[PDB]
Amino acid sequence: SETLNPSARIMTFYPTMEEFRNFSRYIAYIESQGAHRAGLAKVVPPKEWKPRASYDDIDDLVIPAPIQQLVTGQSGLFTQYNIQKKAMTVREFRKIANSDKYCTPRYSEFEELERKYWKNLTFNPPIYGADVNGTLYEKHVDEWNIGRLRTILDLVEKESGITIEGVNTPYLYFGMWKTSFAWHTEDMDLYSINYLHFGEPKSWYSVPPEHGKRLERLAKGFFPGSAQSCEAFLRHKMTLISPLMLKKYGIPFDKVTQEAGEFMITFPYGYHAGFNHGFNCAESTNFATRRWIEYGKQAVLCSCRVKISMDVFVRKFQPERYKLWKAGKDNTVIDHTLPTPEAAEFL
Ligand SMILES: COc1ccc2c(c1)CCC[C@H]2CNc1cnccc1C(=O)O
Ligand code: NI
Ligand SMILES: [Zn+2]
């Protein structure tokens, strides 16, 4: 029942060109409709819109640090170690991805591929061209430009000039079959934007922010070692947990598949994971709304090694609370079901 509640299930949205042109306000729109409570939403951009003319001219693009994803575990509980490989071009990455050893296996519908994924993730370790600095948007595209979204996350750079690779700048991800991202919320529990430029699909699991603590508790239970060492160990982005285990332990979750040309928005304190079906290319970065600031103040951070100083955000957007907050006496409690204040117009 908390399991099935559609107020917390993954929504898809199909904006007009008109509504698509204003990024930050469409985000408030989708929150006005409950998008946020799943932790993950799909936005299908209008059909005419193309961020780039052709993807035929990137064969020579360098993937500086491809990673080979070794996974270890059994009984739905795994740990992924990314081993660094020599630099290769996109062309050489495509070659390995499409070969007999690494290609997508044969399958009828998504559930079969899903079973193949969870059965074989420890075998035949694929290479993921992850975290490449760069963007495939053409210089001139003013709608949903992952390299320049212009949200209030940019306040750190206005005031200091300081950027953080991947959070304030764009990353590309060249996937092949079975390459994975572990269970995680974003750095500083930010929002994220992920756009599949081309190729085979990317499937995603998301846990609703209102139930995120349950996933932490499950993860503590089955990795107490990792949890002694570091209260926020999910932030290492190394832990995979199967849908069967989530179901079994009462963690509500939902699933969706992202196809070429679609955007996925992850929301504050939204745990997600997933894998690629086959050769593909996705771009992402982080962003913020006014709602994020409290998530930023309260984010439980890695206690054993990325950190945004919230002072500037509280100063600008929460001026009266600032002194009370620096005192350590600001016990604002987050309601994860609430839309951002920018949504108020859509009522
Ligand atoms: C520090 O350890 C890390 C950090 C980052 C990663 C990995 C390991 C595994 C490869 C994927 C990337 C993260 N990839 C994603 C994160 N969130 C949403 C989607 C993706 C994706 O891979 O498409
Ligand atoms: Ni993510
Ligand atoms: Zn840690």
- The secondary structure element, H or E, covering residue 12 is strand 12-13
Find the ligand nearest to 258 CA: 1
Architecture of domain 10-347: Sandwich (2.60)
Distances in Å between the Cα of 62 and the Cα atoms of 23, 137, 186, 284, 333 are 30, 17, 26, 18, 45
Which of 31, 114, 186, 216 does the annotation list as catalytic? 186
Q: Are 136 and 51 in contact (CB under 8 A)?
A: yes
Count of CB atoms within 10 A of residue 83's CB?
A: 11
Supply φ then ψ for residue 97, to 5 degrees. -55, -45
Closest by CA position to 283, among listed 188, 202, 209, 205: 202
Question: If you ran DSSP here, which 8-state letter would residue 330 be given?
Answer: -
Distance CA 123, CA 115 (A): 14
> In what side-by-side order are the strands of the sheet with 180-184?
180-184, 271-276, 202-207, 254-258
Residue count of the chain, please give it.
347
Count of CB atoms within 10 A of residue 33's CB?
A: 13
**Catalytic residue flag (residue 76):** no
Experimentally, how was this structure solved? X-ray
Identify residue 89 by its one-letter amino acid code: T
**Catalytic residue flag (residue 166):** yes
Distance CA 229, CA 339 (A): 35
Closest by CA position to 273, among listed 231, 313, 314, 215: 215
Q: Are 239 and 183 in contact (CB under 8 A)?
A: yes
Q: Are 212 and 183 in contact (CB under 8 A)?
A: no
Count of CB atoms within 10 A of residue 38's CB?
A: 27
Q: Is 103 annotated as a binding residue?
A: no
Count of CB atoms within 10 A of residue 181's CB?
A: 21
Q: Where in 39-126 does DSSP place strands (E)?
A: 40-43, 62-63, 67-74, 77-84, 88-89
The pair of three-digit structure tokens given for residue 162, joined into one six-digit string = 């300081």
Q: Are 110 and 203 in contact (CB under 8 A)?
A: yes
Count of CB atoms within 10 A of residue 98's CB?
A: 14
Spatial CB neighbours of 331, under 8 Å, sequence gap ≥ 6: none
What does DSSP say about strands 254-258 and 202-207: parallel, antiparallel, or unpaired?
antiparallel
**Catalytic residue flag (residue 272):** yes
Q: Are 290 and 317 in contact (CB under 8 A)?
A: yes
Spatial CB neighbours of 173, under 8 Å, sequence gap ≥ 6: 128, 129, 130, 131, 132, 281, 282, 283, 284
